[PDB]
């Protein structure tokens, strides 16, 4: 094509093209106010219309990267608001784009977008096109690596809720349930795509490929290997592009894959019929979130082709990567009950056994029992999940969260308290999600979502590194990541953090906070007790936090609140010292 911007405008249409460009600009520039990005989006779209009518007109032949990066660099207040981001404009492509990507903020710390139902409907009434457009902007800047086409879909969910619910009598009780369910979908989606970009950045395509091969084979067991290879190749490209900012190519390539999957749906999966007669946004999303199809009845034991076939060392020698992919395809489709990282763990073992056995004198007799090395690999995650789920059921979410905060704080006491509270809190929600499921679904829920939380920690750690052992767990191997964090224990040579009274001094401003923030304030205190007294047992810690809870409720009920906090605070501090000894 002469003009790639023409090609994408034609392919995507004005509305989607607009929506993506707004998401792009809000991810690279997370602070500048709404109306500013609206102007930029408008100018790009105007220019895109100039190029589709005349593919030959000036600047239309330039690359999407050149055009987008040039646009960012002509923003007034770029240096004033974004500081070092302006230094990226001195670089030429492709180093200019890498520079912008590395300055995206994963913890921008913006005001929590609370659902104010009466206040929102009035904004929805006054300016609806701005209301849909502002949702995209607010979610984009909060989540900079969020899958662009994915955000459009969820933005369409947001206006469908508000149009429906606003004119009813009970405006709030129609909305708050629907919006709080949307929030949890955004958090999960952001987490999933962030792991994809993290994977490219620290491991490359080959690791992303194995991950997708394994997941898609579970998703589509009836699909043949050539079909799975095709989708994987196509999908890996979509993610590289979305992860790299190529937001228009991302969306375009995604649509082509959806069309493809739907045109080959009998060959791929019976669960796709519902998806495949929907409008294109909804069709893409449905395919991405489709359930795992039924396991076909006619599958032969893996043993014949992978332990028993005598010519495997020749097979392995001729096409190493293609042959292990076959193994991974065949193993993953039979085991929808296994987590993805576990499947990669197993496949790594298979690869490594073939290297030692084919080097040895007699391979067929050696590798005949390679499947026996997987038995311990499966029992290990099964044990972890059982133990956490029995704990979660025994004690409830809040306490389970606190247990994890104590656990992870002991593992890595150099990590910041906000980060430790975030991980413990998130992992407790995972317990609510996964422990209630059947065992066929419980292991993979637990370990797949645990991988998301550990990636979040790793991403914050790459930003502001504090611990070598965390760095090793985050950089060494994606498959072995969860095992690596599990193997962390408190160091014998960790020096208890110095006591600061202010750190355990509460005030009456806690009383006017919402419960979630009230808890965070209390859970932060928990982490700080551990950092200060790392050899205190979980049972000593639970008792002292209980006394802090009683102190906070007592004084928040009192008529003179700040005088209560003043009298009772110091007493509780000094007795807690003796309690934690
Ligand atoms: Zn082209
Ligand atoms: Zn053309
Ligand atoms: Zn579209
Ligand atoms: Zn570079
Ligand atoms: Zn968010
Ligand atoms: Zn989604
Ligand atoms: Zn990259
Ligand atoms: Zn995707
Ligand atoms: Zn690119
Ligand atoms: Zn053979
Ligand atoms: Zn899940
Ligand atoms: Zn290393
Ligand atoms: Zn306070
Ligand atoms: Zn509370
Ligand atoms: Zn002390």
Curated annotation (Swiss-Prot):
SUPFAM superfamilies: Serum albumin-like. Ca(2+) 2 binds at residues 11, 252, 256. Zn(2+) binds at residues 65, 244, 246. Pfam families: Serum_albumin. Keywords: Allergen, Calcium, Cleavage on pair of basic residues, Copper, Disulfide bond, Lipid-binding, Metal-binding, Methylation, Phosphoprotein, Repeat, Secreted, Signal, Zinc. Cu cation binds at residue 1. Ca(2+) 1 binds at residues 4, 241, 246, 249. The modification N6-methyllysine is found at residue 531. One of its GO terms (molecular function) is DNA binding. The modification Phosphoserine is found at residues 3, 56, 63, 416, 486. One of its GO terms (biological process) is cellular response to starvation. GO terms for cellular component: cytoplasm; extracellular space; protein-containing complex. The modification N6-succinyllysine is found at residue 561. Plasma. The keyword Amino-acid biosynthesis does not apply. Binds water, Ca(2+), Na(+), K(+), fatty acids, hormones, bilirubin and drugs. Its main function is the regulation of the colloidal osmotic pressure of blood. Major zinc transporter in plasma, typically binds about 80% of all plasma zinc. Major calcium and magnesium transporter in plasma, binds approximately 45% of circulating calcium and magnesium in plasma. Potentially has more than two calcium-binding sites and might additionally bind calcium in a non-specific manner. Interacts with FCGRT; this interaction regulates ALB homeostasis. Interacts with TASOR. In plasma, occurs in a covalently-linked complex with chromophore-bound alpha-1-microglobulin; this interaction does not prevent fatty acid binding to ALB. This is Albumin. It comes from Equus caballus. The gene is ALB.
